[PDB]
Design a protein around this ligand. Structure first.
Ligand SMILES: [Cl-]
Ligand SMILES: [Cl-]
Ligand SMILES: [Cl-]
Ligand SMILES: [Cl-]
Ligand SMILES: [Cl-]
Ligand SMILES: [Cl-]
Ligand SMILES: [Cl-]
Ligand SMILES: [Cl-]
Ligand SMILES: [Cl-]
Ligand SMILES: [Zn+2]
Ligand SMILES: [Zn+2]
Ligand SMILES: [Zn+2]
Ligand SMILES: [Zn+2]
Ligand SMILES: [Zn+2]
Ligand SMILES: [Zn+2]
Ligand SMILES: [Zn+2]
Ligand SMILES: [Zn+2]
Ligand SMILES: [Zn+2]
Ligand SMILES: [Zn+2]
Ligand SMILES: [Zn+2]
Ligand SMILES: [Zn+2]
Ligand SMILES: [Zn+2]
Ligand SMILES: [Zn+2]
Ligand SMILES: [Zn+2]
Ligand SMILES: [Zn+2]
Ligand SMILES: [Zn+2]
Ligand SMILES: [Zn+2]
Ligand SMILES: [Zn+2]
Ligand SMILES: [Zn+2]
Ligand SMILES: [Zn+2]
Ligand SMILES: [Zn+2]
Lengths: 244, 244, 244
């Protein structure tokens, strides 16, 4: 029989986002929360949602297979330390857009290293669709994606160093250099442009998109999101929940 | 002159769907009805819509070039017998999603045979986009589609036997095995996965998608639907209405 | 450093459309105006919007890098003459859909010549998605587009002569002949079918799509629009504003 029907929820996931962000980043979080809610129709998993990460010390995080951060990262020492302990003890992460933002004022070296080394460098403006290219066509995140496709509008970040420079990072999707020169207000002219990657030392994926209220208009990118979430969940060292 | 402008409506079509179905299947029917209404702007055809197939014995069906079943099939003996006579006398059908659902309690062998032999076997859950592949790139349904593309979210059915096992069936679109393992709650791991086909003994096409309120977000799948409808309509043994 | 961040708005653009048009052409204009408004978040450029082109003699047009005509062309002699002088003195144009419509009753030979020679010939009906093909994969308008893709629904125009017959026209995107026979009410069976082009004697692009309230459902076509606008703006003989 080719199908494994769940008898009970398979794993637990936590969504964290903030309402204290530019409007477009709140809009994305709201819609992405709907996206994940719909993935949990029929209670395939346990999904908890919060705007307040202060209530989640490590002891209350450890039960989660994955934390999905839609728009921001922890900003207080206690929250940051809880997240670090979680990730260092085999926790899962799916991060979007400004959840990875960091700069000279972040003062969180653990997180810069968790991301693969990249500090924010530059971005195009305004948000626009772009041609994207799959770096590894065999990977579970991208095996059922077209090798290249146009992703819907976002503003896109470069980092320094590029995450690709880290041999422990696998870049999975990149913005094509065919997009250059990229931008109308703020124009990006050259450089490496990874947009989805994983630091292989952690059970984590980062996706650079997540801006505004039209990110779910295309099946292709929607499938990338499903795949990203599924991959991180499947890799739990305690057992692949999809085999239960 | 390369264009044939209609002087009058070209053919008649009937949409049948039910409101007595899970919410997502009612939503799809409603949106698909809008899709077809828009195709009939300017009265290219006569479009009648019903939620009550009991009012349509064979004598009242025979005038229709095609019946579009958006979410369900006839459930009473009288309705089933009217539909059988219609299809056996050269009628047209475009069916979606659970319009083909059948199982050990259906007790309608004519319809299982009409579909090509397949009884419901399994499905993934939750609805998600998937990579789909065109089986015959030359066919009128698929000649202007990309050879592979991502279709928007649905839950997808396997059947036993596969409709492909029937030599009288032409499979037109299939879910790629690159999608395996497919599912988060209910996981499909292997098997043939046709999703659009025609039993060549009838003027009919079946499309497995049709779930929820976001099935029309992509041009590509929208074009598949146009093409499916146009093909069945064009094949009327009484004459191709598009030549009038 | 690979990015050029604007210090001030880079150029000025004018949108003109009419509310005195079929509903679908007003809907497109409204949504396209939103699209351009969003491109101007953060004041990358100066964007002025009007439904009344009578207020724009040549002296008041000359300051604009580009005029975007979403649904119609000037109909009075004074408006037509202002637009002619503007375009003959290095002005920019991005036109959509019925902004290029012209027939035996237009009586504006300058404009027929500006467009590349084509008078309206025929169209399919109803609006539907179609397979489109990039004619020049290296051009700034199309270099980051897939070589072929399905565009969302519009009704599509043929012209006589084809704009392609003019050696001064570069055709950039064409409706594939794989779409033939095209139409349900009004059926197009053959012929050249360019849909995006530029008369190289002017700083102008024409895009045939622009019908209804669902033209922005796909990233790919959205990217074509961004690229079309950016290309015309970049070519200003007074200097590429993106270098400032
Ligand atoms: Cl803690
Ligand atoms: Cl977009
Ligand atoms: Cl997976
Ligand atoms: Cl009957
Ligand atoms: Cl989807
Ligand atoms: Cl056809
Ligand atoms: Cl003037
Ligand atoms: Cl469409
Ligand atoms: Cl450009
Ligand atoms: Zn606040
Ligand atoms: Zn500091
Ligand atoms: Zn510090
Ligand atoms: Zn491969
Ligand atoms: Zn490849
Ligand atoms: Zn290492
Ligand atoms: Zn953003
Ligand atoms: Zn009921
Ligand atoms: Zn029984
Ligand atoms: Zn029985
Ligand atoms: Zn071929
Ligand atoms: Zn092929
Ligand atoms: Zn046979
Ligand atoms: Zn369903
Ligand atoms: Zn779309
Ligand atoms: Zn009026
Ligand atoms: Zn006249
Ligand atoms: Zn005249
Ligand atoms: Zn090339
Ligand atoms: Zn090529
Ligand atoms: Zn010349
Ligand atoms: Zn139109």
């Amino acid at each position: 029989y080719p199908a494994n029907y769940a008898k009970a929820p398979r794993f637990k996931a936590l969504i964290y986002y903030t309402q204290h962000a530019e409007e477009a980043h709140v809009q994305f979080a709201e819609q992405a929360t709907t996206f994940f809610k719909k993935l949990n129709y029929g209670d395939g998993f346990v999904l908890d949602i919060t705007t307040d990460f202060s209530k989640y010390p490590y002891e209350k995080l450890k039960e989660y297979n994955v934390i999905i951060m839609l728009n921001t990262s922890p900003n207080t020492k206690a929250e940051r330390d809880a997240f670090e302990q979680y990730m260092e003890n085999g926790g899962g992460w799916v991060g979007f857009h400004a959840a990875a933002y960091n700069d000279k004022n972040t003062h969180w070296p653990w997180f810069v290293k968790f991301l693969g080394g990249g500090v924010f460098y530059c971005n195009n403006w305004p948000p626009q669709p772009v041609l994207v290219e799959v770096d590894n066509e065999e990977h579970p995140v991208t095996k059922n994606l077209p090798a290249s496709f146009v992703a819907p509008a976002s503003e896109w970040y470069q980092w320094t160093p590029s995450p690709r420079q880290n041999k422990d990072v696998e870049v999975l999707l990149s913005l094509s250099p065919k997009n250059y020169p990229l931008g109308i207000k703020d124009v990006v002219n050259f450089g490496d442009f990874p947009i989805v990657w994983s630091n292989k030392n952690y059970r984590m994926i980062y996706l650079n998109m997540g801006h505004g209220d039209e990110e779910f208009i295309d099946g292709t990118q929607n499938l990338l999101l499903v795949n990203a979430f599924r991959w991180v969940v499947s890799k739990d060292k305690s057992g692949n929940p999809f085999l239960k």
